């Protein structure tokens, strides 16, 4: 739809920052479309990732960091508030100790800071979604 | 680039048919973009899949069928002829007993027919690629 995907935007984050995303999966959940949001340390797509949030719709969520080019300890959740065929509103808030991921207004995932969020310079939203809103609070 | 992705095309297959695809991953291999080619029994995206071919670039390939709405026995290969950052040419030929997947001219994967290829009515190419050529031999 509206915004280009992969969507890349420079960004600065600290405690109190929120990244809000509105979009819709490109396929029914039976086909397991993905959604990924990556908080990068540089504008380059190959740069380190402080927080990677990857949804396999209908199946699971995996979260991780990529540090010095290597993926670290993967974390997995089977929590699946996303609804088949529906638009979703996703909100990632930077708390002192962690990211809080809200889905359609409900707290759904958390991920402890492995690297200070001040290291983030860029956010990328990609994989099997259409995107209508991307906003960073400043 | 040129063709819309997800790309959907009605198709009929039998022994001797070849599906040729030219495209390029949308991200470096470090980011693990996917490619998927699905041979569907109906035009609907939720219909059964006689052969699902899913590349996680730089990591693995998984192949499966979805029968009566249920994914069946997954098959996995770590063969990875795809080259980071490069355009690829992918060719899926229907042999009497199996699909043969050629990558840039080299035989790379096979998948035995679980359902006759004559059951196919539609092919979908999607996930993290740009697509410049899609052709079915008739």
Curated annotation (Swiss-Prot), chains A, B:
Q: Does the keyword S-adenosyl-L-methionine apply?
A: no
- Tissue expression pattern: Expressed abundantly in the bone marrow. Expressed exclusively by eosinophils and basophils. Not detected in monocytes and neutrophils. Expressed in CD25-positive regulatory T-cells (Treg) (at protein level). Found in intestinal tissue from patients with Celiac disease, expression is directly related to the histological grade of mucosal damage and to the number of eosinophils found in the duodenal lesion (at protein level). Found in sputum of patients with eosinophilic inflammatory diseases such as asthma (at protein level).
The superkingdom of the source organism is Eukaryota
Q: What is its main location?
A: cytoplasm
Q: Which GO terms describe its cellular component?
A: collagen-containing extracellular matrix; cytosol
Q: Which GO terms describe its biological process?
A: regulation of activated T cell proliferation; regulation of T cell anergy; regulation of T cell cytokine production; T cell apoptotic process
Q: Which residues carry this modification: N-acetylserine?
A: 1
InterPro entries given in the database record: ConA-like_dom_sf, Galectin-like, Galectin_CRD
The protein's site described by Not glycosylated is found at 135
Per its database record, what is this protein's job? Regulates immune responses through the recognition of cell-surface glycans. Essential for the anergy and suppressive function of CD25-positive regulatory T-cells (Treg).
Q: How does it assemble?
A: Interacts with CEL.
The protein in question is named Galectin-10
